[PDB]
Amino acid sequence: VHRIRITLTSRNVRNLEKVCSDLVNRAKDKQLRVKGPVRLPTKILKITTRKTPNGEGSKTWETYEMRIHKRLIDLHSPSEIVKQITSIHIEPGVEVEVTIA
Amino acid sequence: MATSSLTPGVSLDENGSIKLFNKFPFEGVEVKDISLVDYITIGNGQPLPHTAGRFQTKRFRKARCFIVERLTNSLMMNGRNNGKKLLATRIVKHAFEIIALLTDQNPLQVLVDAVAACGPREDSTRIGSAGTVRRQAVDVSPLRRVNQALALITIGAREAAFRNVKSISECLAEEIINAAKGSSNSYAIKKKDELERVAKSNR
Amino acid sequence: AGVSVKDVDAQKFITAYAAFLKRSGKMTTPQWIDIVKTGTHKELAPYDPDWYYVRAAAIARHIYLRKQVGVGRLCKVYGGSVNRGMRPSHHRDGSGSVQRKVVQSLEKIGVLEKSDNGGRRISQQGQRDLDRIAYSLLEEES
Amino acid sequence: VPVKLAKVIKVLGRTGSRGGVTQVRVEFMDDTSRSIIRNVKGPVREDDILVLLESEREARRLR
Amino acid sequence: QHATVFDKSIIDRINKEVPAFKFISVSVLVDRMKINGSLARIAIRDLAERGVIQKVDQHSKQAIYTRVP
Amino acid sequence: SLVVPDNFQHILRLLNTNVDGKVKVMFAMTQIKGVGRRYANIVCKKADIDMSKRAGELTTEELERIVTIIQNPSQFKIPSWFLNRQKDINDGKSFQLLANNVDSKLREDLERLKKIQTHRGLRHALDLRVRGQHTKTTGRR
Amino acid sequence: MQSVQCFGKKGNATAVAHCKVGKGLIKVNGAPLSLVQPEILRMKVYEPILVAGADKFAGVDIRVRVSGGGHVSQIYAIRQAISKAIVAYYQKFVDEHSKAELKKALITYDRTLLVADPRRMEPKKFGGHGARARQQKSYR
RNA sequence: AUAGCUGGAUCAGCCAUUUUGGCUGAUCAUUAGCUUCUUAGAGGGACUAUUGGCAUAAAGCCAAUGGAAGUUUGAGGCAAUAACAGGUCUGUGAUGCCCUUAGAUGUUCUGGGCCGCACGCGCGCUACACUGACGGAGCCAACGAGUUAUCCUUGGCCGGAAGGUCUGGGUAAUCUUGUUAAACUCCGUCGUGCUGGGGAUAGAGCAUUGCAAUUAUU
Ligand SMILES: [Zn+2]
């Protein structure tokens, strides 16, 4: 009736994995259909620019990369447990969002 | 025997006949002109000339390539058509069947005899380094003989069919049959004679 | 023998279905009988005046093979390279008016039916006609 | 009569000013003797057949 | 140049000249006679329903035909 | 497939122009100035004449009916969106362009653009391109 | 039951199959092996079928789906997929010596049917449209 | 179940069919379990192992089976050292010096422009034809982007696909999108002639973007 979907979008692999491990461990501490992590395709943004501030010089083009990683988690937790786990899952560099309905 | 799919008996009969060519036999054709053995894969029977493989990785990997495939590769000239293998394969197939229609013998045998007769024996490299800038008579390797024959046949076919009603396949077939025998009407044979005579002249 | 159009030659089936549709002959082709070049990609007049029938047959077979077909999808699948003057050729879709006209004509015939989730679907009569014409083509060799 | 096939089994290295001409030792079939040195414009490997007409040249090197 | 006047001679000539050769196509008939291209394929199509020429393998550019034997 | 011993009468004068005798009608009609390819195809199709036959076997009735249809295209259910000239400057209608009239229409348009003395007019007088093209490197000799 | 699965690739083309026990019914994406998109590229698909004949194929039902790549890539993918599906079926459900002889026969007459083909296009480098081709220098 | 596979409430099409059905699938959050194929966290794997040969029978070299891999596994990135009297004070509230500051070398609104040509030099493009062009038809990929007021687009309908119509999907591997591409192929014509190969070049109307398209945006 009340399914909680939370986002696990970030760029730091280590910290997003740590957040994902923490919530999965809590979801295994209290049985909530033990739904595990789900991995989404990486959204990588490729931009190519020049290096020379002026126009003089050889044709050199620098390509930069910007990739983000998304994960989704579905839980059957009650409101009190949901607010508790979100309180303990405060980490830097991790953006989370919960959709109710 | 047959399955739900049509499975035409032509393929089954081809398999029974030790997998001959598209419409020509494979068992009974060999290089008859001497000095060009172990460099043309006549015995390597392939249903189609095309073979997307590695033909330049090794120093002499080119020697094991199919003679028909090498000729299709030579026909890939004119960068307007650089990369259109389907057109070259259709032209080669049409030329081969026209050769079979003209003369009863194996068109592959016609082809092998043509390249063998066209292949130059004596060339003339340049000494260079300024001075008299003369040239000296030099013989050539069998692999380069095939290369010269293929290039001369292809350039002659392109020159003959550059502006005329006759099709490219017909002109290629005419060049191959005229080069397989001695009729003095082949541009490739003429260039063969020209290279030989200049080589003997500067020798 | 459970024969469908999957194991039938493409161009021969298109011509045969065009002739079969020609038997009914209720397309009611629009005013631009032989003046519209079915889009911007084309640049001349067709040499076969009966291309409306072959187009209708092609659409019927296309909707049989696929799930849903739209006007925009029909333009992108029946477009082609455009000779944009001296500039290198690009790809542009065809005119939607002609494709919509053929779609409406086929629906008036009773071969295409509208469906949910956008687009349309193949009618029951279209499927039965497809099966019978496939059987007839397979048995055409006595 | 001028046409006589020969065999090459070894190479003396890559010679020539431009390096595009090789020099190899030849060996005739009908005469196991009479080993000559000739300048070949094509790539020559071990145990390869050669066709030569002016059999009496004994070319040493190319300048 | 190739003539195109239908002077009753071309139709009889081609009908009595088909058995001369086996391979019949636009490339060879141009050499055979001054044909401008239209009759080149029209005559072949009109002779297809006759038993003189037997088809082998047809293509859009050209089609292969052979004689009776 | 068709009658071989037919009638041939070489070429004939048409609209102060020559129509080729032994030539495919599509090729022959391009010789008439003001005729393209699709225009030639559509007018012949609306004229309802056999396409296989060339212009050397046509009769007087077919020739006259074809040219009259060309002279009056819009009257014979020919669409007006195809017409080269629509809403003429002088006529005020979608008049059809021809060969003899275009022999003087080009100079008539030149005097139309020159008398009123446009920038385009002086470009035409000085024989330079009228559109915003470039001549720094191209447009030479 | 007796069934296996496999796939085949030639770069940016993929073709995944699903072997099954049957009495024929061999098709390639609805159409049979006889009817394909090209016409001069038919014997390439037919290459592994003729080597072992159709008697061994009379006891298998295989339908192979093709997705991705060009025309030559697709025909190579489907022929690779059917060849590997057949050898997987005959490795798992008939004698090892029979598989050894079939694989060896396929290897002896092999147009890269079984062995994967690591053919890839090198990345384009800056300074020119091609990876190695570069714009000409006016040198003056 | 933000993507595919199978079972299953869920129904359509006939040759066979009342044990006799194959198949496309329609809906798939109505429902269940799995990732061969989608994704990423960790990884394994090759080190020229393995014999067959050269090199002072070390460091090192060549060929071959297996394998995916032998070129340092490939292609790239960062890259010591000093040299250019190289470029950028018109990217830089980064700045030293000379000059100006009210009739301002300050801000700002309108019109003309950087694209203005009897030429010389470049980087790329078009055809010089049948390998092409035209016309129908079968169809086979990847990387990337998008609305908080105001972008990517679907569907019914009108049209001269150039536009506009209304409910509308999309803050996103859920919508465009599965970017059904092109090249190719089945068939007919153009028959070899600077012609229907090639559209330099000139004219008349039809629309969106933009105080508005002359010096024609497209
Ligand atoms: Zn800036």
XYZ file of N, CA, C and O in Angstrom, chain B residues 24-141:
472
model
N 30.690 -22.809 -61.175
C 31.809 -23.412 -61.880
C 32.475 -24.467 -61.010
O 32.487 -24.349 -59.781
N 33.033 -25.511 -61.620
C 33.706 -26.549 -60.832
C 34.999 -26.043 -60.212
O 35.653 -25.133 -60.727
N 35.364 -26.655 -59.085
C 36.613 -26.351 -58.398
C 37.644 -27.463 -58.483
O 38.842 -27.178 -58.440
N 37.214 -28.716 -58.595
C 38.127 -29.850 -58.689
C 38.468 -30.077 -60.157
O 37.611 -30.491 -60.945
N 39.716 -29.802 -60.524
C 40.152 -29.971 -61.895
C 40.784 -28.726 -62.480
O 41.097 -28.684 -63.674
N 40.976 -27.702 -61.651
C 41.599 -26.453 -62.070
C 42.878 -26.256 -61.267
O 42.875 -26.373 -60.035
N 43.974 -25.988 -61.973
C 45.271 -25.751 -61.358
C 46.042 -24.775 -62.232
O 45.719 -24.577 -63.406
N 47.067 -24.161 -61.646
C 47.939 -23.289 -62.423
C 48.808 -24.153 -63.329
O 49.523 -25.051 -62.868
N 48.714 -23.916 -64.635
C 49.471 -24.690 -65.609
C 50.753 -24.001 -66.042
O 51.747 -24.681 -66.317
N 50.754 -22.673 -66.112
C 51.982 -21.943 -66.385
C 52.917 -22.054 -65.189
O 52.511 -21.827 -64.045
N 54.172 -22.409 -65.455
C 55.153 -22.629 -64.400
C 55.607 -21.286 -63.841
O 55.292 -20.231 -64.404
N 56.319 -21.324 -62.712
C 56.948 -20.193 -62.021
C 55.958 -19.353 -61.224
O 56.330 -18.266 -60.761
N 54.719 -19.812 -61.032
C 53.758 -19.058 -60.234
C 52.974 -19.963 -59.291
O 51.814 -19.677 -58.974
N 53.588 -21.051 -58.830
C 52.938 -21.964 -57.897
C 53.167 -21.478 -56.471
O 54.022 -20.620 -56.227
N 52.391 -22.016 -55.528
C 52.512 -21.722 -54.100
C 52.269 -20.249 -53.780
O 52.673 -19.767 -52.718
N 51.615 -19.518 -54.682
C 51.272 -18.127 -54.423
C 49.859 -17.761 -54.855
O 49.447 -16.617 -54.639
N 49.109 -18.682 -55.456
C 47.720 -18.458 -55.836
C 46.892 -19.589 -55.242
O 47.169 -20.766 -55.503
N 45.880 -19.236 -54.450
C 45.072 -20.229 -53.739
C 43.929 -20.709 -54.636
O 42.752 -20.406 -54.434
N 44.310 -21.483 -55.654
C 43.319 -22.080 -56.543
C 42.545 -23.177 -55.821
O 41.327 -23.310 -55.990
N 43.235 -23.977 -55.005
C 42.585 -25.071 -54.307
C 41.655 -24.636 -53.194
O 40.756 -25.398 -52.820
N 41.847 -23.434 -52.658
C 41.000 -22.925 -51.581
C 39.641 -22.554 -52.159
O 39.457 -21.463 -52.702
N 38.678 -23.467 -52.044
C 37.350 -23.225 -52.583
C 36.508 -22.408 -51.622
O 36.353 -22.767 -50.450
N 35.959 -21.301 -52.120
C 35.118 -20.418 -51.328
C 33.838 -20.130 -52.104
O 33.900 -19.802 -53.302
N 32.667 -20.252 -51.473
C 31.414 -19.971 -52.195
C 31.318 -18.547 -52.717
O 30.721 -18.326 -53.777
N 31.888 -17.575 -52.006
C 31.863 -16.183 -52.423
C 33.270 -15.603 -52.419
O 34.081 -15.936 -51.547
N 33.592 -14.745 -53.392
C 34.922 -14.113 -53.393
C 35.202 -13.286 -52.150
O 36.347 -13.252 -51.682
N 34.190 -12.621 -51.597
C 34.399 -11.775 -50.430
C 34.778 -12.613 -49.215
O 34.229 -13.694 -48.989
N 35.732 -12.105 -48.431
C 36.136 -12.751 -47.181
C 36.695 -11.661 -46.269
O 37.846 -11.246 -46.429
N 35.881 -11.213 -45.317
C 36.274 -10.142 -44.403
C 37.234 -10.715 -43.369
O 36.841 -11.116 -42.273
N 38.515 -10.754 -43.727
C 39.536 -11.260 -42.833
C 40.766 -10.378 -42.784
O 40.714 -9.207 -43.172
N 41.880 -10.930 -42.311
C 43.139 -10.202 -42.204
C 44.032 -10.606 -43.373
O 44.463 -11.760 -43.463
N 44.307 -9.655 -44.265
C 45.129 -9.905 -45.439
C 46.392 -9.058 -45.483
O 47.127 -9.122 -46.476
N 46.667 -8.266 -44.446
C 47.867 -7.442 -44.416
C 48.602 -7.487 -43.084
O 49.587 -6.759 -42.923
N 48.160 -8.308 -42.128
C 48.799 -8.332 -40.815
C 50.234 -8.844 -40.896
O 51.119 -8.331 -40.202
N 50.485 -9.846 -41.730
C 51.808 -10.434 -41.863
C 52.504 -9.915 -43.117
O 51.896 -9.290 -43.989
N 53.810 -10.182 -43.191
C 54.600 -9.726 -44.330
C 54.130 -10.372 -45.628
O 54.045 -9.706 -46.666
N 53.822 -11.668 -45.590
C 53.393 -12.407 -46.771
C 52.023 -13.049 -46.567
O 51.721 -14.086 -47.159
N 51.185 -12.437 -45.725
C 49.817 -12.917 -45.563
C 49.015 -12.751 -46.848
O 48.046 -13.484 -47.077
N 49.411 -11.802 -47.699
C 48.708 -11.560 -48.953
C 48.796 -12.743 -49.910
O 47.945 -12.871 -50.796
N 49.803 -13.606 -49.755
C 49.967 -14.733 -50.665
C 48.874 -15.782 -50.506
O 48.624 -16.542 -51.448
N 48.222 -15.843 -49.348
C 47.175 -16.826 -49.100
C 45.780 -16.308 -49.427
O 44.807 -17.054 -49.276
N 45.656 -15.059 -49.868
C 44.350 -14.514 -50.205
C 43.824 -15.135 -51.495
O 44.588 -15.580 -52.356
N 42.499 -15.167 -51.618
C 41.870 -15.713 -52.812
C 42.194 -14.851 -54.027
O 42.170 -13.619 -53.959
N 42.501 -15.511 -55.146
C 42.849 -14.787 -56.366
C 41.665 -13.960 -56.854
O 41.829 -12.818 -57.301
N 40.456 -14.521 -56.778
C 39.265 -13.767 -57.158
C 39.055 -12.594 -56.210
O 38.708 -11.486 -56.637
N 39.261 -12.817 -54.908
C 39.115 -11.734 -53.941
C 40.144 -10.638 -54.175
O 39.828 -9.446 -54.074
N 41.386 -11.021 -54.480
C 42.414 -10.028 -54.773
C 42.038 -9.196 -55.993
O 42.283 -7.985 -56.029
N 41.443 -9.833 -57.004
C 41.016 -9.106 -58.195
C 39.845 -8.179 -57.899
O 39.791 -7.058 -58.419
N 38.894 -8.624 -57.074
C 37.842 -7.718 -56.626
C 38.438 -6.551 -55.852
O 37.987 -5.408 -55.986
N 39.460 -6.826 -55.039
C 40.159 -5.764 -54.327
C 40.853 -4.811 -55.294
O 40.876 -3.595 -55.068
N 41.438 -5.343 -56.370
C 42.045 -4.477 -57.378
C 40.986 -3.669 -58.116
O 41.211 -2.501 -58.454
N 39.822 -4.272 -58.371
C 38.723 -3.575 -59.027
C 38.106 -2.501 -58.144
O 37.284 -1.717 -58.630
N 38.481 -2.445 -56.867
C 37.998 -1.421 -55.949
C 38.556 -0.038 -56.271
O 38.347 0.901 -55.501
N 39.236 0.109 -57.408
C 39.875 1.365 -57.781
C 38.838 2.477 -57.953
O 37.632 2.275 -57.781
N 39.330 3.675 -58.289
C 38.451 4.814 -58.539
C 37.642 5.209 -57.309
O 36.461 4.863 -57.204
N 38.284 5.913 -56.370
C 37.726 6.222 -55.058
C 36.274 6.662 -55.050
O 35.667 6.732 -53.976
N 35.709 6.994 -56.213
C 34.255 7.042 -56.326
C 33.632 5.718 -55.895
O 32.553 5.698 -55.291
N 34.300 4.600 -56.193
C 33.822 3.270 -55.831
C 34.660 2.606 -54.743
O 34.474 1.413 -54.480
N 35.576 3.337 -54.109
C 36.371 2.794 -53.006
C 35.451 2.447 -51.845
O 34.958 3.328 -51.138
N 35.228 1.151 -51.637
C 34.376 0.669 -50.570
C 33.088 0.018 -51.023
O 32.309 -0.422 -50.170
N 32.827 -0.055 -52.328
C 31.614 -0.687 -52.846
C 31.976 -2.085 -53.342
O 32.192 -2.322 -54.530
N 32.041 -3.027 -52.398
C 32.414 -4.397 -52.732
C 31.276 -5.160 -53.396
O 31.529 -6.043 -54.223
N 30.029 -4.841 -53.046
C 28.895 -5.538 -53.643
C 28.851 -5.317 -55.148
O 28.584 -6.251 -55.913
N 29.118 -4.087 -55.593
C 29.186 -3.817 -57.024
C 30.311 -4.606 -57.683
O 30.125 -5.184 -58.760
N 31.485 -4.642 -57.048
C 32.611 -5.382 -57.611
C 32.312 -6.874 -57.684
O 32.658 -7.537 -58.669
N 31.677 -7.422 -56.645
C 31.349 -8.844 -56.644
C 30.355 -9.184 -57.748
O 30.495 -10.209 -58.425
N 29.339 -8.338 -57.940
C 28.376 -8.569 -59.012
C 29.042 -8.484 -60.381
O 28.742 -9.284 -61.276
N 29.943 -7.516 -60.564
C 30.652 -7.383 -61.834
C 31.517 -8.610 -62.092
O 31.539 -9.151 -63.205
N 32.240 -9.071 -61.068
C 33.091 -10.246 -61.222
C 32.251 -11.482 -61.524
O 32.608 -12.296 -62.385
N 31.122 -11.639 -60.828
C 30.239 -12.771 -61.094
C 29.699 -12.728 -62.518
O 29.656 -13.756 -63.205
N 29.279 -11.546 -62.979
C 28.782 -11.420 -64.346
C 29.886 -11.680 -65.363
O 29.648 -12.307 -66.401
N 31.098 -11.193 -65.090
C 32.214 -11.455 -65.993
C 32.534 -12.943 -66.057
O 32.781 -13.486 -67.141
N 32.531 -13.619 -64.906
C 32.867 -15.039 -64.875
C 31.840 -15.876 -65.629
O 32.205 -16.790 -66.378
N 30.550 -15.585 -65.442
C 29.525 -16.348 -66.146
C 29.538 -16.057 -67.641
O 29.232 -16.945 -68.444
N 29.886 -14.829 -68.033
C 30.012 -14.516 -69.453
C 31.179 -15.285 -70.061
O 31.091 -15.784 -71.190
N 32.284 -15.406 -69.319
C 33.424 -16.184 -69.795
C 33.032 -17.645 -69.975
O 33.395 -18.284 -70.971
N 32.282 -18.195 -69.016
C 31.813 -19.572 -69.140
C 30.884 -19.733 -70.337
O 30.933 -20.750 -71.038
N 30.022 -18.742 -70.579
C 29.139 -18.798 -71.741
C 29.933 -18.748 -73.041
O 29.590 -19.433 -74.012
N 30.994 -17.940 -73.081
C 31.793 -17.821 -74.297
C 32.565 -19.106 -74.576
O 32.394 -19.733 -75.628
N 33.418 -19.517 -73.641
C 34.239 -20.710 -73.793
C 33.929 -21.688 -72.668
O 33.687 -21.282 -71.527
N 33.944 -22.982 -72.999
C 33.431 -24.005 -72.093
C 34.343 -24.269 -70.902
O 33.878 -24.816 -69.896
N 35.620 -23.904 -70.983
C 36.550 -24.230 -69.914
C 36.277 -23.364 -68.682
O 35.506 -22.400 -68.718
N 36.915 -23.731 -67.578
C 36.673 -23.074 -66.297
C 37.115 -21.617 -66.350
O 38.278 -21.346 -66.677
N 36.238 -20.656 -66.047
C 36.669 -19.248 -66.043
C 37.779 -18.964 -65.049
O 38.590 -18.059 -65.280
N 37.835 -19.709 -63.942
C 38.962 -19.582 -63.025
C 40.264 -19.977 -63.710
O 41.300 -19.330 -63.513
N 40.230 -21.039 -64.519
C 41.409 -21.425 -65.288
C 41.780 -20.350 -66.303
O 42.965 -20.058 -66.502
N 40.780 -19.756 -66.959
C 41.034 -18.614 -67.835
C 41.699 -17.494 -67.053
O 42.649 -16.858 -67.525
N 41.202 -17.235 -65.845
C 41.730 -16.152 -65.027
C 43.171 -16.422 -64.611
O 44.024 -15.529 -64.675
N 43.459 -17.652 -64.179
C 44.808 -17.990 -63.732
C 45.791 -17.918 -64.893
O 46.914 -17.419 -64.748
N 45.388 -18.416 -66.064
C 46.250 -18.326 -67.238
C 46.479 -16.875 -67.643
O 47.579 -16.509 -68.074
N 45.449 -16.035 -67.515
C 45.575 -14.635 -67.905
C 46.574 -13.899 -67.020
O 47.457 -13.191 -67.517
N 46.446 -14.050 -65.700
C 47.359 -13.364 -64.791
C 48.769 -13.927 -64.920
O 49.757 -13.195 -64.784
N 48.889 -15.233 -65.174
C 50.208 -15.832 -65.355
C 50.897 -15.296 -66.604
O 52.092 -14.982 -66.575
N 50.160 -15.186 -67.712
C 50.747 -14.664 -68.941
C 51.062 -13.179 -68.827
O 52.045 -12.708 -69.411
N 50.243 -12.428 -68.088
C 50.462 -10.993 -67.956
C 51.628 -10.667 -67.032
O 52.301 -9.649 -67.232
N 51.883 -11.507 -66.030
C 52.898 -11.238 -65.038
C 54.273 -11.015 -65.634
O 54.817 -11.865 -66.345
N 54.859 -9.852 -65.353
C 56.173 -9.532 -65.920
C 57.276 -10.395 -65.334
O 57.226 -10.815 -64.176
N 58.292 -10.651 -66.155
C 59.453 -11.426 -65.737
C 60.675 -10.562 -65.464
O 61.371 -10.779 -64.467
N 60.951 -9.585 -66.324
C 62.096 -8.699 -66.174
C 61.612 -7.260 -66.080
O 60.867 -6.793 -66.948
N 62.037 -6.564 -65.033
C 61.718 -5.159 -64.823
C 63.013 -4.350 -64.851
O 64.095 -4.878 -65.124
N 62.899 -3.054 -64.565
C 64.051 -2.154 -64.586
C 63.871 -1.114 -63.484
O 63.115 -0.152 -63.648
N 64.565 -1.312 -62.367
C 64.553 -0.339 -61.288
C 65.518 0.804 -61.593
O 66.402 0.696 -62.448
N 65.339 1.910 -60.878
C 66.133 3.113 -61.087
C 67.276 3.165 -60.081
O 67.064 2.967 -58.879
N 68.488 3.415 -60.579
C 69.646 3.524 -59.697
C 69.570 4.801 -58.868
O 69.867 4.797 -57.667
N 69.162 5.909 -59.487
C 69.015 7.157 -58.765
C 70.351 7.763 -58.367
O 71.384 7.552 -59.011
N 70.317 8.537 -57.278
C 71.497 9.221 -56.743
C 72.132 10.139 -57.786
O 73.356 10.263 -57.865
N 71.290 10.787 -58.585
C 71.716 11.725 -59.632
C 72.647 10.987 -60.599
O 72.481 9.784 -60.843
N 73.628 11.691 -61.152
C 74.550 11.054 -62.078
C 73.881 10.784 -63.411
O 73.187 11.641 -63.969
N 74.088 9.575 -63.933
C 73.530 9.193 -65.224
C 72.060 8.803 -65.149
O 71.447 8.595 -66.203
N 71.492 8.718 -63.940
C 70.108 8.323 -63.659
C 69.604 7.266 -64.637
O 68.482 7.355 -65.148
N 70.423 6.248 -64.886
C 70.063 5.169 -65.795
C 69.173 4.159 -65.072
O 68.658 4.411 -63.979
N 68.969 3.000 -65.693
C 68.210 1.915 -65.093
C 68.886 0.594 -65.427
O 69.587 0.477 -66.435
N 68.669 -0.401 -64.571
C 69.281 -1.712 -64.721
C 68.208 -2.791 -64.734
O 67.181 -2.677 -64.058
N 68.459 -3.845 -65.507
C 67.503 -4.938 -65.619
C 67.458 -5.740 -64.325
O 68.498 -6.136 -63.789
N 66.249 -5.978 -63.822
C 66.041 -6.730 -62.592
C 64.839 -7.646 -62.774
O 63.830 -7.252 -63.369
N 64.951 -8.872 -62.270
C 63.810 -9.771 -62.241
C 62.922 -9.441 -61.044
O 63.272 -8.636 -60.179
N 61.743 -10.066 -61.006
C 60.740 -9.755 -59.998
C 60.223 -11.052 -59.382
O 60.335 -12.134 -59.963
N 59.657 -10.926 -58.181
C 59.142 -12.051 -57.416
C 57.763 -12.475 -57.917
O 57.035 -11.677 -58.512
